[PDB]
Structure formats: structure tokens, C-alpha cells
Design an enzyme around this catalytic site. Structure first.
Site, PDB file in Angstrom:
ATOM      1  CG  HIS A 119      -0.428   0.386   2.499  1.00  0.00           C
ATOM      2  ND1 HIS A 119      -0.162  -0.551   3.474  1.00  0.00           N
ATOM      3  CD2 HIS A 119      -0.087   1.585   3.031  1.00  0.00           C
ATOM      4  CE1 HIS A 119       0.312   0.055   4.549  1.00  0.00           C
ATOM      5  NE2 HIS A 119       0.367   1.351   4.305  1.00  0.00           N
TER       6      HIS A 119
ATOM      7  CG  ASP B 199      -0.326  -3.849   2.680  1.00  0.00           C
ATOM      8  OD1 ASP B 199       0.131  -3.418   1.614  1.00  0.00           O
ATOM      9  OD2 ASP B 199      -0.563  -3.110   3.658  1.00  0.00           O
TER      10      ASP B 199
ATOM     11  CB  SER C 273       2.315   2.511   6.147  1.00  0.00           C
ATOM     12  OG  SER C 273       1.096   3.013   6.589  1.00  0.00           O
TER      13      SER C 273
END
EC number: 3.4.21.5
Lengths: 18, 27, 257
Positions: free
Chosen positions: C43, C99, C205
Site C-alpha cells: 500500500h 500487503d 506503514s
């Protein structure tokens, strides 16, 4: 998942690239 | 190969401030 | 990272900062798994709903850093990407299943006191350590709070932050969200009544969730910061990509042999 962190970073000299 | 052993810690047999918290939880 | 603490120098030498060339901005965390490979969340590079789709020419990898904004001369190293690989079955359409993404560096990076790779788990290490209650460690330069008034300070840290969190039982993870959870993710964090708290947040992230093996004293990356609802909210948990379950894919694209 308001913050993007874009403005207070110090520039990186070209002598550091590769 | 030499993975996961930190130069400033495991390699020198020094522990960081909170790694014990992890080990104490492993059981 | 919310409710974390300043990291010690060299405490997380596999920590990588994914940096956008222009405008110069922090995009995500990542981890160094060898001299030429970096692991991160898919992502961070591709998310169509927000028209995010970065190519190798759009970013730089910064390795060996402690300070978030400074150019740590003589310490940090910068690398350009040769190629990006996103999992072919990355499900950005519904729940961020799989992911994960690998990034090949143009030239091998040289190791040092501040730059060193993390290990990837073998089947047995994953088996012994991935259990409810066992704590792992998450690091990043992400936001310190979910929200904070503008002009009134900065919800951004000046130095890498660290927080240790316990892995949570699967039914508790599932009952905390409306999103459909898969076997390729696990969640972590304290429950409302455990007293302590902490979580990863925006900017964290793609960063590593690691654990130290008590069998051989090595650090292993068990997860990748994937998603969470808000940051450090009671009743909510952070979700992570299950690295071991996607290891065959990782080994496949590396073809190291």
C-alpha cells in the site's frame, strides 16, 4: 487508515546519490 | 547469515533498554 | 508511533525510510533484508482509490537513520531503486490482503554499526513465537497522535520511535473490526483493560514488526505495519502482514540461487 510530512526535511547533496 | 545480530548490541553482548520486556513475555 | 519512546542509536539497523524525491516527503517505513533487498507494504507504493501509484523513479531509500528530518552526514546511506515488485494478489480493492512488496536496490549497500539486515522467519521460528501474549516491537517516524491541532506543535517525532506490543488472539482481532480478516494478517496491541497502550500510526506503514528469538538471540521480522482504525483507540488493534505466510513468494522473486 491528517499528516503527510512534507516541508521540514533537510536537502540531500548530490554527492550522496548513486 | 549474520542477520538479526546488531553491531551495537548482540555483537557486543549489550542489551537495549526494553528487549527484556519481550523475552519475559515469551512464556 | 503513539505512546512509544525514543529509540537508542543502532537499536533498529534494518529500519529503512521510504522517501519521495519531490516534493521531499516521508512516505513509509521499510526493512532491510539483505544488501540489495528492502521489504515494505504494497500500500506504500500502490493504492488506486487515492490514485497512489509510485514507480522506481519516484523515490529514494534512506538507510541507517535516526533523525527524521536531518541529513545524517557520514551515517545514513541513500539508495535508488532498480525495481519494485508488488504481490500479484495484493487485494487493494477490499481488505489489503497480501500487503507486501519487495524493492531491489540499484547497488548493494555496505553494512555498518547502523545498517544491518533483519532475519526472515523459518517455519519453526514462526511457530514458536507467533502466539497470543508474546510481544513484538514496532518502529517508525510516523505520527505521535491520531490528531493534533495545526500550528500548535507537531505530531511528528524528531527521532525514530519504538513501542513493544503483544500479539492478540485471532477472535479478538476479528471482533474489533468490520473488515474481513485473512490468514495473511495478525493484529497486535493492548486491550482496553490491560492498562498500557501504544500503536503504530500514519507514516509508520510498511515498517517492521520484529521479535527476538530466545533460542538463537537473533531478531526476526514477523510482520509489516499494514492498517488500523485510527491510532491507539481503545478496543482497536493494529494489523500486520504475516510475513512467514508470504515467504515462498519472497524467496521466489529473489531467486537468490
Amino acid at each position: 487508515x491528517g499528516g503527510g510530512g512534507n516541508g521540514d526535511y533537510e536537502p540531500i547533496p548530490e554527492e550522496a546519490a548513486x | 547469515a549474520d542477520c538479526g545480530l546488531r553491531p551495537l548490541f548482540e555483537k557486543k553482548s549489550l542489551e537495549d533498554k526494553t528487549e527484556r520486556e519481550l523475552l519475559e513475555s515469551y512464556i | 508511533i503513539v505512546e512509544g519512546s525514543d529509540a537508542e542509536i543502532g537499536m533498529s539497523p534494518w529500519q529503512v525510510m521510504l522517501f519521495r524525491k519531490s516534493p521531499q516527503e516521508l512516505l513509509c517505513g521499510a526493512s532491510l533484508i539483505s544488501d540489495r533487498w528492502v521489504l515494505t507494504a504494497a500500500h506504500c507504493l500502490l493504492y488506486p482509490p487515492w490514485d497512489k501509484n509510485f514507480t522506481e523513479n519516484d523515490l529514494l531509500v534512506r538507510i541507517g537513520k535516526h533523525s527524521r528530518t536531518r541529513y545524517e552526514r557520514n551515517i545514513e546511506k541513500i539508495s535508488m531503486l532498480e525495481k519494485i515488485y508488488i504481490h500479484p494478489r495484493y487485494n487493494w480493492r477490499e481488505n489489503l490482503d497480501r500487503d507486501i512488496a519487495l524493492m531491489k536496490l540499484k547497488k548493494p549497500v555496505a553494512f555498518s554499526d547502523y545498517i544491518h539486515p533483519v532475519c526472515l522467519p523459518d517455519r519453526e521460528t514462526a511457530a514458536s513465537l507467533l502466539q497470543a501474549g508474546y510481544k513484538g516491537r514496532v518502529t517508525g517516524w510516523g505520527n505521535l497522535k491520531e490528531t493534533w491541532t495545526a500550528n500548535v506543535g507537531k505530531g511528528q517525532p524528531s527521532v525514530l520511535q519504538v513501542v513493544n506490543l503483544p500479539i492478540v488472539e485471532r477472535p479478538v482481532c476479528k471482533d474489533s473490526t468490520r473488515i474481513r480478516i485473512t490468514d495473511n494478517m495478525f493484529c497486535a496491541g493492548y486491550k482496553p483493560d490491560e492498562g498500557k497502550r501504544g500503536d503504530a500510526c500514519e507514516g509508520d506503514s510498511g515498517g517492521p514488526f520484529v521479535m527476538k528469538s530466545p533460542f538463537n538471540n537473533r531478531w526476526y521480522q514477523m510482520g509489516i505495519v499494514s492498517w488500523g482504525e485510527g491510532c491507539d483507540r481503545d478496543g482497536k488493534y493494529g494489523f500486520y502482514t504475516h510475513v512467514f505466510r508470504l515467504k515462498k513468494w519472497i524467496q521466489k522473486v529473489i531467486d537468490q540461487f
